[PDB]
Homo-oligomer: A and B are copies of this chain.
């Protein structure tokens, strides 16, 4: 009965969703810790955790790392993160003792700009190429190098994205993607931070609702 990643990968995206619907109905009833426990018990390959080290990143990092100590933490350095994020990554990595795995584009940001100009200023196709070089290519290489088959991420339905209907389990980039805190609201996030002695990203106090790259 254990889900077969290879078989699932052979089905159209639409059909993968139908195949996981039942599993997702049961995962939805568990809490974040139990969802992580279930994945570790029923999902394959190497387990990895990714984070953008944004405003509320401390929650997913602490929660998953507590259950799976030294789990590889994939960070995609675009070369354009806020300086506060870099120091936040350094701080959290040291505090939670994260097995950090930094991945970056094939060449430096200066090299990229020398070749293509400022891609984020070139409409939809530029932004698309930028993400491919700085986020998509590096992450795919990471999953491969780390032999990942199960990937934990800290996405939440209530964040400003097309994530309102995201399930706990899905297949993405050819691997199982697990979202333990997919249903957490801001109150639950705060309570978790308070309880475990964690903090929001430093730019929260400068009024940043979210953080990524800065130009």
Contacts and interface: CB of A to CB of B under 8 A. Distances in A.
A10 interface: no
Interface in A103-118: 104, 107-111, 113-115
A90 B110 CA distance: 13
Contact of A80 (B102, B110, B115): B110
Interface residues of A, number: 20
Interface in A28-82: 77, 79-81
A85 B83 CA distance: 26
B111 A86 contact: yes
A184 B114 CA distance: 31
A169 B120 CA distance: 48
A77 B107 contact: yes
Nearest to A106: B102
A163 interface: no
Contacts of A110: 77, 79-81, 83, 86, 109
A111 B87 CA distance: 8
Contacts of A115: 86-87, 90
A212 to B, nearest CB: 13
A110 B87 CA distance: 11
A120 B109 CA distance: 19
Contact of A108 (B84, B90, B104): B104
A113 B77 contact: no
A102 to B, nearest CB: 7
A106 to B, nearest CB: 9
Contact of A102 (B85, B102, B107): B107
A6 B80 CA distance: 44
Ranked nearest first, the 3 interchain pairs of A and B with the lowest CB-CB distance are A86-B114, A83-B114, A79-B108
Given A86-B114, A86-B115, 12 more contacts: A77-B108, A79-B108, A81-B110, A83-B110, A83-B113, A85-B114, A86-B110, A86-B111, A87-B114, A90-B115, A108-B109, A109-B110
